[PDB]
From a paper:
Quantitative data about starch phosphorylase protein abundance and enzyme activity are lacking and no crystal structure of a plastidic plant starch phosphorylase has been reported so far. It is known that starch phosphorylases are members of the CAZy GT35 family of glycosyltransferases and catalyze the reversible transfer of glucosyl residues from a glucose donor onto the non-reducing end of an α-glucan chain. While Pho2 is localized in the cytosolic compartment, Pho1 is a true starch phosphorylase that acts on starch in the plastids of the plant cell. We determined the crystal structures of HvPho1, the first crystal structure of a plastidic plant starch phosphorylase. A native structure of HvPho1 and two complexes with acarbose and maltotetraose were solved and refined to resolutions of 2.7 Å, 2.9 Å and 3.0 Å respectively.
The third crystal, soaked with acarbose and G1P, has no ordered electron density for either substrate in the active site. Acarbose molecules were modeled, one for each monomer, in arc-shaped electron density going through a gate formed by Tyr900 and Tyr905 and adjacent to the active site. This gate is already formed, albeit unoccupied, in the native structure. The acarbose molecules have their non-reducing ends overlapping with the position of the glucoses in subsite +4 in the maltotetraose soak.
Numbering used by the authors:
A (entry chain A), B (entry chain A): 69 to 495, 553 to 968
The structure:
């Protein structure tokens, strides 16, 4: 397969699967054609993988998530096929430039943050390692939002990634499943339950092939798009004039796939958010059930189901899988409860990504009882069993103990106990065993996940322990063997090899192969070359060359002009008080103030030149987070155009941060910040990406930083701030008026309140770092406390950067210490210790 | 190009431009693949035709219509490419059957009745004869409606023809034009008018290639699909919960293409109906303007516009082209009024399809003034000129004369006259020259078409004369050279060659070539063979063989079982009191009654066995038309299951009549009915289709029947009923109580009122044939008057059918007399006498 033939197939797709006029000439047009030419390879390989999986009928794993941050497919598809050189030349022939063409591809708006990017990285590694595994998701039209930066801060625009269609998917019109909303349950002649009536939609399959690296294995991401058949369009309504009414039925179905994480401060938003989940679970399980059946054929035994199927619920969003699977087995296939439940408990597993026990999904029983009444019946039964198992394992004898065990583990909170358990609380019945209308009737989804899965895991050593000790303690006591750890990882193909080709050449030279891309353990061979002068020279050149593409990005996106000969200091993550963008910007503001009260000779002596880059999206409704992006932009306007500063310091907020932005930013980064309040982050995947590219980390002892620090070495990581255990106490200390801040912290607050950063003044923002008690005040995320520790830790970063021998030594040790954080070994662990699947290699 | 290669390309499209799972196996799946394989040929040819038209820059013709009844594309594409034999074999290889595959294609819901089917036939003939010509239309999603027959009569279901996408179109993403609604006009610095504000949508192009027969020429049907850019989606509205509000902007744009002829008894339906038209006109003219400019390049002279462009407004729906063209020339290109108007008058032309002067499109000025204010300004100016030209040509001297000329020709009725004309009516001003609020302010679109076009034509000799004498008399007096005739035609490739292959073989044998398909004049060589016994034998066999496919259709669609050894008597057209389905069914009911009051020996002696087939759609809101389909179905239920009748008589209502149904029905038809009240039909295209297939016509002296009768011979056409001139008098005779019906007509009415046809009784329906005066009563369409003439004319049809020598003799003379009714010569006439275009043959 040479470049001359690819050039023909690109031309062919431009003209014979066309989207534009023939005489029209666009980089974009070249993209859709090039996309389709690569896609031909994925189809061949996808069909081969599909067909051979059916033959072998091995256990298949299924990863359900509400997010898939897929990113641009072109550069990684071509890379994994190893046609990256020849496609480039094929495009020269046609008067195009691969890099330039690739940058016309829009980012699929199928995800948002870590949850989704993990999932996507997991799909790459599953394919690359020949594991039989699909992802199931939903096909979002507008996604979360396209972020634009005005002079008012952030604004939100709905995404346009499907406007011309997605070349990377295949519609499967034969694959349509019915999904039902509302309705009621009745008991038919045959003793069996039947869910009738309500509202009915159809989920249709849109497949996105996932090609593996140096393998024919091409796995799949099956994406549901909701609709209703044209016949549900009401002509009477339309011809009468009421055009919205005529379209109402279609809107109801279609809106399930409109927006990611739709705002739920309205009963109609909660119902939609809930329909999104049930749709994903139901459609996906119906499809999985169908595959099991067609493969098993005549010799069909449902006891084989969990040895042929593994479902993985990513976070609590897919919880409904549990009762839904029970629904189909009993109501549709005619299994008994115990036979169905045994299969369910062994099929399903749960991964938790939160460290806080009050960030776990809860739903009003009333809302759920209305929308999915059959599922509540089933949940009710599950909760009754759960409680009879707690009864067996503890009490009658000690009741107040039993009382505590039952609160912790119940799925339905503030509900009348079943007559069985209720007995044990008579005096008549204790207040505890009755519904109290003063509070809502709530369904706790995390608890239902733990009850329903055979395995529960966290995403970092520290976090998986918090999960056992704080979050699900009484459950761990009951079922200790459930609980596991699976530290996250990221694919080295997207996050080193293809986003950082310059570094990748350097790596393969000195290690003596490019095999590290696949077997990333062989990066450790770099430890010994850390001090070698020549390596250091190539390594600094590369970093510098990668920074020049960011100069183009900043120039292009913001308008600001920045020099690549500064430290590229990057904080890039969702805007939140707890992630503490505010801590970083206030630290920059401190250095700015010092520069201004210092002679132009001394400014150079005291501070290394920096380009401090922020990025990320603020939840639209989050007032304070949006004020924070506003504030940062204002600092940039003031700092960047100040004659006294020049190129000594620039502050930039890159808009619309996404996979494509990260791909340019990350390889160019020298310092990255991961400074969340200690014990608030569960893992963090960007941490791992940065280190792989030789970027140094400044951060707290929190999440993935803790293990990253172990692997790369404590000497090569800038640590600061309060540790997780110290936190609760520092806050209680604050509440009783005992916290007195550093004078330098009050200095900055007053210097911000001075009005130096525009007409905004921000007395309100600084007000969130003051007082001793109250929502949104009282410095809950310890910005003032960690401040002195932090700015002093930044002085150590300056002083290390002064010795580019030391800096680059540490840079190389970070790449050399990254092997542990490859999603490849994360997948192995999942495959071996949870799903119990094996790889399937086609001959 | 042999069948072995086509079989590969079909397989290729199934697997490499897929719509289904790979293991899935469907006739439907085979269709989408086969469609795409043929399409490869159309693309090649379309691009060649497109490119060569640009080189030659000849005058191009443009046919605007709100309807295109395209029909299934597969059988006609393959036919026109002459790959019809090899595609059939290519499909045998893959385990499929072309006929069976073809029948999986859905009918595009892009039209409805004659207006649209004419347009489509016109596009075939334009391509076949190498004329440079496009069609411009709109891309309807749900169309008019899918008709289903229940036991309640007709019901309407929205169509599903786009549910899996149209394989026969190409989206042209670079071709998008902005269209504006509401807004206001202001005069900018540069003396020029500027239309600002309002609502803005975009029309995107979806091209449908039109391949010609035995030519590479592939012309185009450009179809506009309305939308707005994703950014107009309101996330704030969506996240707040108001999901319809968030989607409102998209609904407004998208609904313009939802339904054909949306119900307009509501101000919101009228506004939509009006937006549909403006969108079609604006988008299309902007595109035409763009093509003229790019071709002309540097040497650009707008005086050349009408020698390089011809627009044809089909009916009054595209009238807005006139002021829209004026808008762009003056406001956008900077032409003066006279320079713009001269170009407009010579570019545009109008075809009229109505015989009634009160069936001509009128719009409220207020509604138009709100939606398109700039166009009303322009119309106002046009009407003022028009009136100053009437002033020149008539009056001041005779004023009451002038008064009459001004009523007849005004575009804006019930509006204050311009100060110029108003002068002439002082006493102060005459009531006539003032707005009278007692009546609406109306814009008469037909008059604006006549003022704005260089040519005005009817669609039949008789009708084109009515147009000159009754409808536009004062205009004919003023501009006699405007007025023309262009008798309709239908393509012989779709309506003989491809729908009736059995007859087509017979034709080519005896004429000694298949060249008649193209040069249809050579059907006249059949006159001499009309009596030859052998021809007659093959000819009757064919007709009989074609009737057996209708037996399958009836069995399949209705459930009824019918014998092909009866007379296939077909009335197939839109359900309307004026088309008089009621006259036909009451005539059948008369024969049924006679059969029942007659011995089983005599039933055979008196009547020939028949299968009487009805078809067509009733306007949903038309109460009486819907009662008529109901009544017919009830007669069928009673007649078809009556032991006394057996196979002597069957009545069938075939549901969902469309192009595909006509293609099976027409070639099987022996008698077809065209019995509209005399002088109510302008032409009729199905008339011409039937005769071409050797079907005999029973009809009134009305529309296309008059010329069909001339061509095939009066001896070979069953004529009955009152002539057009007699009508007005018969109605006035009715109003003054002088009409006394035939006793046999009162007999049937009472026999229907008897309750013999179910629990419905229909006293209401028969009530519409009674009284002397009043809306919906008084037998306005002369059913009772023409009845005796009609049933006696059916006795003559029976007696002719008895002698199958005579019947088949006349059948052959009908085919032999059809040459005049080929759309080919219709097109030549349009090309030569109106558009002034020439054919363009690529070397
Ligand atoms: C989810 C939420 O977490 C954080 O909220 C915490 C408050 O900051 C604390 O003050 C504390 O609340 C305590 C009361 O102040 C105290 O008087 C007593 O009644 O106990 C309360 C215990 O809750 O604890 C809160 C939660 O643990 C954080 O401040 C806040 O930003 C977080 N919510 C944001 C997230 C979203 C969604 O992305 C937005 O919708 C919210 O508006 C944001 O505020
Ligand atoms: C368009 C309409 O045409 C026909 O209507 C005619 C009436 O049948 C006549 O009675 C006559 O109306 C006259 C009054 O009865 C008389 O008292 C005097 O005031 O003069 C009147 C003059 O109009 O003339 C009418 C029009 O020339 C026909 O009966 C009717 O079916 C036709 N409309 C149908 C079409 C559609 C759209 O497809 C439906 O919306 C209507 O409901 C149908 O009725
Ligand atoms: C990797 C990645 C993230 C996750 O970063 P965290 O440190 O987990 O916040 C978010 N967004 C994008 C675009 C990414 O590539
Ligand atoms: C030709 C045709 C018509 C037009 O028939 P009229 O005699 O003009 O009513 C209507 N519908 C279909 C499907 C046709 O093919
Ligand atoms: O922000 C911390 C992130 O850590 C990891 O990426 C988790 O997988 C994700 O759920 C979480 O959001
Ligand atoms: O029904 C009579 C028909 O005659 C012809 O087909 C005309 O083109 C069409 O406008 C009209 O509807």
């Amino acid at each position: 397969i040479d470049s001359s033939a690819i050039a023909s197939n690109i031309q062919h797709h431009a003209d014979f699967t066309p989207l534009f006029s023939p005489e029209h000439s666009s980089p974009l047009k070249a993209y859709h054609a090039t996309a389709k030419s690569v896609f031909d390879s994925l189809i061949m390989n996808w069909n081969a993988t599909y067909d051979y999986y059916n033959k072998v009928n091995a256990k298949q794993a299924y990863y359900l998530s509400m997010e898939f941050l897929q990113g641009r497919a072109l550069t990684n598809a071509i890379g994994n096929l190893e046609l990256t050189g020849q496609y480039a030349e094929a495009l020269k022939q046609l008067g195009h430039n691969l890099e330039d063409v690739a940058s016309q591809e829009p980012d699929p708006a199928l995800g948002n943050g870590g949850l989704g990017r993990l999932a996507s990285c997991f799909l790459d590694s599953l394919a690359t390692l020949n594991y039989p595994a699909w992802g199931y998701g939903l096909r979002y039209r507008y996604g979360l939002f396209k972020q634009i930066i005005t002079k008012d801060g952030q604004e939100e625009v709905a995404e346009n990634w499907l406007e011309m269609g997605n070349p990377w998917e295949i519609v499967r019109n034969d694959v349509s499943y019915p999904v039902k909303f509302y309705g009621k349950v009745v008991e038919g002649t045959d003793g069996r339950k039947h869910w009738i009536g309500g509202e009915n939609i159809k989920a249709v399959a849109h497949d996105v092939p996932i090609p593996g690296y140096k393998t024919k294995t091409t796995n799949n991401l099956r994406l549901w798009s909701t609709t209703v058949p044209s016949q549900n369009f009401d002509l009477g309504a339309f011809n009468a004039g009421d055009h919205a009414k005529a379209n109402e039925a279609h809107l109801n179905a279609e809106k399930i796939c409109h927006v990611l994480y739709p705002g739920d401060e309205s009963s109609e938003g909660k119902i939609l958010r809930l329909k999104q989940q049930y749709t994903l679970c139901s459609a996906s399980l119906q499809d999985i059930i169908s595959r099991f059946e067609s493969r098993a054929g005549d010799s069909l035994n449902w006891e084989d189901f969990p040895s042929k199927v593994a479902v993985q619920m990513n976070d609590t969003h897919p919880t409904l899988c549990i009762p839904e699977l029970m629904r189909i087995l009993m109501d549709i296939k005619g299994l008994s409860w115990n036979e169905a439940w045994s299969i369910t408990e062994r099929t399903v597993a749960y991964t938790n990504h939160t460290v806080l026990p009050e960030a776990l999904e809860k739903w009003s029983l009333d809302i759920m009882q209305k929308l999915l009444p059959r599922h509540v019946e089933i949940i009710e039964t599950i909760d009754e069993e759960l409680m009879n198992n707690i009864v067996s394992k503890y009490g009658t004898a000690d009741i107040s103990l039993l009382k505590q065990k039952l609160k912790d583990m119940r799925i339905l909170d503030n509900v009348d106990l079943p007559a069985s358990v209720a007995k044990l609380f008579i005096k008549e019945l204790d207040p505890f065993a009755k519904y109290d209308p003063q509070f809502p009737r709530v369904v706790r989804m995390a608890n239902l996940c733990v009850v329903g899965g055979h395995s529960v895991n966290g995403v970092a050593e520290i976090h998986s322990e918090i999960v056992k000790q704080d979050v699900f303690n009484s459950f761990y006591e009951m079922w200790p063997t459930k609980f596991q750890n699976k530290t996250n990882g990221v694919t080295p193909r997207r996050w080193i090899r293809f986003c950082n080709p310059e570094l990748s050449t350097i790596i393969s030279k000195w290690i003596g192969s490019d095999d590290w891309i696949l077997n990333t353990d062989k990066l450790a061979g770099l430890k010994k070359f850390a001090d070698d002068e020549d390596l250091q020279s190539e390594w600094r050149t590369a970093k510098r060359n990668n920074k020049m593409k960011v100069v183009s990005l900043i120039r292009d996106k913001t308008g600001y002009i920045v020099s690549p000969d500064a430290m590229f200091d990057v904080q890039v993550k969702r805007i939140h008080e707890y992630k503490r963008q505010l801590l970083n910007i206030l630290g920059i503001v401190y250095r700015y103030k010092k520069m201004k009260e210092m002679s132009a000779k001394d400014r150079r002596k005291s501070f290394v030149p920096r380009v401090c880059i922020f990025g990320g999206k603020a939840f639209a409704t989050y007032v304070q987070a949006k004020r924070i992006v506003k504030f940062i932009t204002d600092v940039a306007a003031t700092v960047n155009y100040d004659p006294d500063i020049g190129d000594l310091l620039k502050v930039v907020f890159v808009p619309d941060y996404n996979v494509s932005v990260a791909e340019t930013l990350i390889p160019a980064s020298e310092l990255s910040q991961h400074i969340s309040t200690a014990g608030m982050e569960a893992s963090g995947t960007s941490n791992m990406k940065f280190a792989m590219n030789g970027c140094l980390l400044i951060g707290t002892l929190d999440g993935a930083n803790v293990e990253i620090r172990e692997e790369v070495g404590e000497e090569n990581f800038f640590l600061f701030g309060a540790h997780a255990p110290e936190i609760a106490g520092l806050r209680q200390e604050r509440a009783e008026g005992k916290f007195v801040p550093d004078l330098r912290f009050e200095e900055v607050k007053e210097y911000v309140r001075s009005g130096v950063f525009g007409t905004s003044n921000y007395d309100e923002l600084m007000g969130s770092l003051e007082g001793n008690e109250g929502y949104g005040r009282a410095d809950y995320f310890l910005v003032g406390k960690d401040f002195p520790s932090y700015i002093e830790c930044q002085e150590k970063v300056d002083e290390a950067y002064r010795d580019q021998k030391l800096w680059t030594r540490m840079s190389i040790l970070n790449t050399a210490g990254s092997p542990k954080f490859s999603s490849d070994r994360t997948i192995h662990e999942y495959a071996k210790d949870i799903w119990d699947i094996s790889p399937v290699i086609m001959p």
